[PDB]
Amino acid sequence: GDCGCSGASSCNCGSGCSCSNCGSK
Numbered sequence: 201g202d203c204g205c206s207g208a209s210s211c212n213c214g215s216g217c218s219c220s221n222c223g224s225k
Contacts, residue, residue, distance in 0.1 A: 204212030208222035217223035 202210035202212055205222055208217065208219055211217050211222040214223045
């Protein structure tokens with residue numbers, strides 16, 4: 201639920217998150 205993404209509006213979805221910044225490797 202967003203919580204670690206310093207970008208993507210905090211989109212740390214990790215899984216669903218698409219963009220790389222949204223959740224690097």
